[PDB]
Design a protein around this ligand. Structure first.
Ligand SMILES: [Cl-]
Ligand SMILES: [Cl-]
Ligand SMILES: [Cl-]
Length: 204
């Protein structure tokens, strides 16, 4: 009878994933979490079976010529095209623009729920990382229904496709393993929804 968002380390997992997608690995926000995932022990706390996490433990700790900072810059910043853009409207808007039609639906939904959760200046609300941070924060506030709506309606319709391509093209053991951790985790949560996941055609 307890909602999935209020148990099994939901908000901790959502925050760790959200922060590592949204913040550079050498930042104050993400560095402590890179430390955690590159250390032994995390797999015993993560809300997924240890046997499933075993290959990810090794991968997070694989040394690599390219630094975490360089990989994150390349995957999430630039200067070149991102291998798997982390904003929903790229996948959901027929034209794949930022601040697209799905981004407005998200904004309208947040306004409707009285949600104020502001992130980077000039950036859209539908970044994968900030959606997980917002959902984590909603869960911490006990707002299980809105947490579930956010996931069902504004993240899950496109997040599987984004992670598929992200994992395929990550090209760094740490971010590949991160994508895989996120894919397993989000799929677990999706299986626990009490409302139907939204279903949308994808354009990338
Ligand atoms: Cl490290
Ligand atoms: Cl629009
Ligand atoms: Cl509620």
């Amino acid at each position: 009878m307890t909602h999935f968002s209020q148990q099994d380390n939901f908000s901790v997992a959502a925050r760790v994933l959200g922060a590592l997608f949204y913040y550079a690995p050498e930042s104050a926000e993400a560095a402590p979490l890179v430390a955690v995932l590159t250390s032994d022990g995390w797999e015993t706390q993560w809300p997924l079976p240890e046997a499933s996490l075993a290959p990810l433990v090794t991968a997070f700790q694989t040394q690599c010529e390219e630094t975490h900072a360089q990989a994150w810059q390349r995957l999430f910043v630039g200067p070149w095209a991102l291998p798997s853009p982390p904003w929903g409207s790229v996948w959901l808007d027929r034209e794949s623009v930022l601040f697209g039609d799905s981004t407005l639906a998200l904004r309208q939904w947040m306004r409707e729920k009285g949600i104020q959760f502001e992130m980077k200046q000039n950036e859209p609300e539908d970044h994968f990382g900030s959606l997980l941070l917002m959902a984590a924060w909603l869960a911490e506030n006990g707002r299980q229904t809105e947490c579930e709506e956010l996931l069902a309606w504004h993240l899950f319709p496109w997040s599987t496709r984004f992670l598929d391509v992200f994992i395929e093209k990550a090209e760094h053991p740490f971010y590949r393993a991160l994508g895989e951790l996120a894919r397993l985790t989000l799929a677990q949560w999706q299986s626990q929804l009490l409302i139907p996941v939204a279903v949308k055609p994808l354009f990338r």
